[PDB]
Amino acid sequence: MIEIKDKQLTGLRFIDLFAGLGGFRLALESCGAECVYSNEWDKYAQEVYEMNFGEKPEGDITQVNEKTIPDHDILCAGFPCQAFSISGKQKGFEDSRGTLFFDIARIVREKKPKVVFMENVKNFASHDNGNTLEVVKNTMNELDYSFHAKVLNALDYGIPQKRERIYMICFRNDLNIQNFQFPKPFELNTFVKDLLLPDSEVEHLVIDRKDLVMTNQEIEQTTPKTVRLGIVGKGGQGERIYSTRGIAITLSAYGGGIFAKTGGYLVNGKTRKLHPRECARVMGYPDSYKVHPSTSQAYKQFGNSVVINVLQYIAYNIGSSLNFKPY
DNA sequence: CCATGCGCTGAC
DNA sequence: GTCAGCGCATGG
Ligand SMILES: *C[S@@+](CC[C@H](N)C(=O)[O-])C[C@H]1O[C@@H](n2cnc3c(N)ncnc32)[C@H](O)[C@@H]1O
Hints:
Layout: E1 13-17, H1 23-29, E2 34-38, H2 43-53, E3 74-77, H3 101-111, E4 115-121, H4 131-142, E5 148-153, E6 161-162, E7 164-171, E8 213-214, E9 228-231, E10 240-242, E11 248-249, E12 264-267, E13 270-272, H5 276-282, H6 295-304, H7 308-323
Parallel strand pairs: 1-2, 1-3, 3-4, 6-11, 10-12
Antiparallel strand pairs: 4-7, 5-7, 8-9, 9-10, 12-13
Helix pairs in contact: 1-7
The protein binds a DNA duplex through residues 78, 80-82, 85-90, 119-123, 126, 162-163, 165, 226, 228, 233-234, 236-240, 249-258, 260, 296, 302-306.
PDB class: transferase/dna
Keywords: transferase, methyltransferase, restriction system, complex (methyltransferase-DNA), TRANSFERASE-DNA complex
Assembly: trimeric
């Protein structure tokens, strides 16, 4: 994450829905805001959350009475994406995991917060010939809110990872906000090679296979893109090997293959996958965050999360707009 | 719960 | 024609 000197969100309160590891919480707290409610139903995720923030989140949002939720200024939500991802079956609103958006709407109707901040995958903007996004935009308009949305790539904000996502920002109409803007991209200067741990600590992740087929030579200069060097098996998800002089492929939660969820890399002459701590680093988390003792739950949690740095820039811009009040 | 072989879609 | 994907399916 980045250091913020000008704390634009001092005095404001927020709630953390579909909490996970708390990526939305780290970002907003660094800007000066205070968290007054959290919700998440997974046993293992509630354990890391409590380990790091000192509180246990509430369970199943579909059966929580929206009137019991505390007053707040900003609602945060990185809702489920299996029903919209290009890697799944694309069932959309027909999917039992695809209706969570209407629960958010239910809460927004009652509490009427100043800002709604949401995140989902890139395919969300294209799904069902554009109907899915129009449905979300019209619902927010009907509740008396404006709608701003755009797809941003993590590699343009200083983190070496190809992770394209859609961010949706909404302001209550009586506030009359007319100067909000998404942050501007800058040049990348850090690469996969600069975030790795010492060879001694990662010996156990090395994989030596006999069907390894190199198809490209190692590159001699760094570059802001994914560079594939070789393959194992039939070359499907989890069987592709990349260079550490380039950037990392997007991390997943339920992925398979011998190099599952992280992908494989050529390091000092050997091929291996990433360690949980290196996953924390490519997601923008500080070395002081404590990970789950179970390696299996840790990879799943990081693959479902958000890049901290990108949210910090967006949150600062939300505060700047709220504070501009001339006579 | 955990590990790993798959097979199709979207955007070039 | 080439390449990537906060995923699915089945074995123990
Ligand atoms: C995909 S993920 C959010 C990650 C988070 N932004 C981060 O780690 O920083 C979605 C999370 O939502 C939880 N979830 C799914 N359905 C429910 C219901 N109905 N009630 C509560 N929580 C739910 C998932 O377990 C996941 O962690």
